[PDB]
Amino acid sequence: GPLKPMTFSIYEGQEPSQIIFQFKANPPAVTFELTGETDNIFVIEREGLLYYNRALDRETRSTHNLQVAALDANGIIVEGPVPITIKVKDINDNRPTFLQSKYEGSVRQNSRPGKPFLYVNATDLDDPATPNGQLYYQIVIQLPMINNVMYFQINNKTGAISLTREGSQELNPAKNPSYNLVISVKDMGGQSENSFSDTTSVDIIVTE
Amino acid sequence: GPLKPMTFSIYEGQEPSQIIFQFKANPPAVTFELTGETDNIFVIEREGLLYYNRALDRETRSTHNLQVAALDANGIIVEGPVPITIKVKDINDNRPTFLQSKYEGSVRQNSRPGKPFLYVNATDLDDPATPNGQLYYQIVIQLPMINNVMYFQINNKTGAISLTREGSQELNPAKNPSYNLVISVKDMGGQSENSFSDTTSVDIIVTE
Ligand SMILES: [Ca+2]
Ligand SMILES: [Ca+2]
Ligand SMILES: [Ca+2]
Ligand SMILES: [Ca+2]
Ligand SMILES: [Ca+2]
Ligand SMILES: [Ca+2]
Ligand code: NA
């Protein structure tokens, strides 16, 4: 039918195994012209076969804005150009990376439970609107630890470290002036399958 | 385009708010048929509208293996069937449960510290490779307790109960012949936020 705007969604990181679309020339159109963000990847054959020639990369270009025009036997545009939008669908091909391998923090004796005093942070180049770039932070270990009582907690979404109820009650620089936490981060929103992880080390001084 | 295998990942425990996918019939296809693990949940409209009509439950079915076929006006399959995979993403919707509500054990006086003599165990129906099913064991209280000294300890990952150094030094059937421990188990790795818990009771006789 008439040439019109179209959107195609194509996963990145996959070498092409299927065409995108076969356009059919409406006489007096005989050939097609593809322009825009083709990047030596998107091709239209003379008689309308639109395809891609190699794996896409959302982290290089997340949308290819293309245009297609239909031309007559004299090379005159008779339909379009119209916008053809390629949405590059994300895969989990980037690992989360803590921005420091060691954090130095401090907390006041009697800091209110749940009040952040330190943020750890990781970046993930995947799409944060998808599981692939959605990070989940956790405390792997606290040292020292007495009778399995955690004195620290982390906001699993934000990386905010705060005292627990019991940490607020028990932390005392006279008894134990420093704690080490090992923190993990994983992508896939903390789900198991196809996830990547990183760790960092946090030393926390307890002050008056 | 042509029917091909597709995977969708959907969280359990949420009322559906969006369709899954609209299949568009390419002539001579006119309608679609859905088969497989539909479970009075997954439906396709003739026209192509694939949706789910009630919350999923990973603990009932963790992957729905569906198939979609395109039928012509005479009900001949002209495309597919192709596998449509629904991966059900886990939420923390199950409380961990101890396998016994009461444990009875014993420990010999002058037993070595840190050597397990009793395992408590809980199970959690959520995914154990996620925080939702990741368990953390603690002693809530030991009675009797002498001068604020713990005589017992528990491994927070394994549920292994052993004597402390002080317990090994002080246990004596003539002075205190029995102890009770209340043990907790928590999921989310033991953090307070978004976690569920159970408790059990452990009676321990001190022997000669
Ligand atoms: Ca990529
Ligand atoms: Ca990632
Ligand atoms: Ca990616
Ligand atoms: Ca469930
Ligand atoms: Ca659980
Ligand atoms: Ca669950
Ligand atoms: Na205490």
Numbering used by the authors:
A (entry chain A), B (entry chain B): 29 to 236
Sentences reproduced from the published study:
Contrary to the canonical Ca2+-bound linker, such as the linker between EC1 and EC2, the linker between EC2 and EC3 in LI-cadherin does not contain Ca2+. Generally, three calcium ions bound to the linker between each EC repeat confer rigidity to the structure. Another unique characteristic in the region surrounding the calcium-free linker was the existence of an α-helix at the bottom of EC2. To the best of our knowledge, this element at the bottom of the EC2 is not found in classical cadherins.
